[PDB]
Amino acid sequence: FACKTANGTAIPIGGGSANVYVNLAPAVNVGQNLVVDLSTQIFCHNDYPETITDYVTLQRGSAYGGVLSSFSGTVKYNGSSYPFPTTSETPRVVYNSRTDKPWPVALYLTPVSSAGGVAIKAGSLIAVLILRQTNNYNSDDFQFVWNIYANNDVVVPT
Numbered sequence: 168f169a170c171k172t173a174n175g176t177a178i179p180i181g182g183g184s185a186n187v188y189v190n191l192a193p194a195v196n197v198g199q200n201l202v203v204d205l206s207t208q209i210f211c212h213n214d215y216p217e218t219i220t221d222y223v224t225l226q227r228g229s230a231y232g233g234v235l236s237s238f239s240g241t242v243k244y245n246g247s248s249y250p251f252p253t254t255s256e257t258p259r260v261v262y263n264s265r266t267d268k269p270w271p272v273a274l275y276l277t278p279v280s281s282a283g284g285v286a287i288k289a290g291s292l293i294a295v296l297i298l299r300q301t302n303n304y305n306s307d308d309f310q311f312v313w314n315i316y317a318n319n320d321v322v323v324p325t
């Protein structure tokens with residue numbers, strides 16, 4: 168089992184970490200949603216699907232930078248909603264193919280009233296999402312750590 172981002176970089180068998188650079192709406196009003204869809208960015212596959220079933224969860228999701236200070240939100244994992252930052256592990260998603268399949272994570276972040284001017288700086292760390300992978304075959308229990316960085320500034324008008 169292994170994963171990769173749309174702009175190249177990979178995390179190998181056994182887990183590890185990688186940076187993901189995401190384009191964000193340049194402006195979002197208080198009470199409107201900023202959507203960070205990682206299904207277009209993070210892909211995973213099963214290396215031996217004839218024999219093994221891989222199980223994948225969102226173990227933990229946390230906010231950093233401007234998202235931590237100026238936004239509240241939820242995370243959608245495989246169509247279901249959870250508070251973000253997370254306090255519980257999600258149900259699993261099954262990976263049973265060599266073909267790259269999206270990791271179905273999306274963040275829904277709404278600016279709080281207090282926000283104004285530049286809320287998210289370009290290049291800043293905005294989230295860490297931990298993908299946890301197990302299987303039906305042995306004791307493998309791996310973390311794939313995705314560090315999410317903003318490609319551009321996000322302005323929240325006062």
Ligand SMILES: [Ca+2]
Nearest residue numbers: 212265266267
């Ligand atoms: Ca592949």
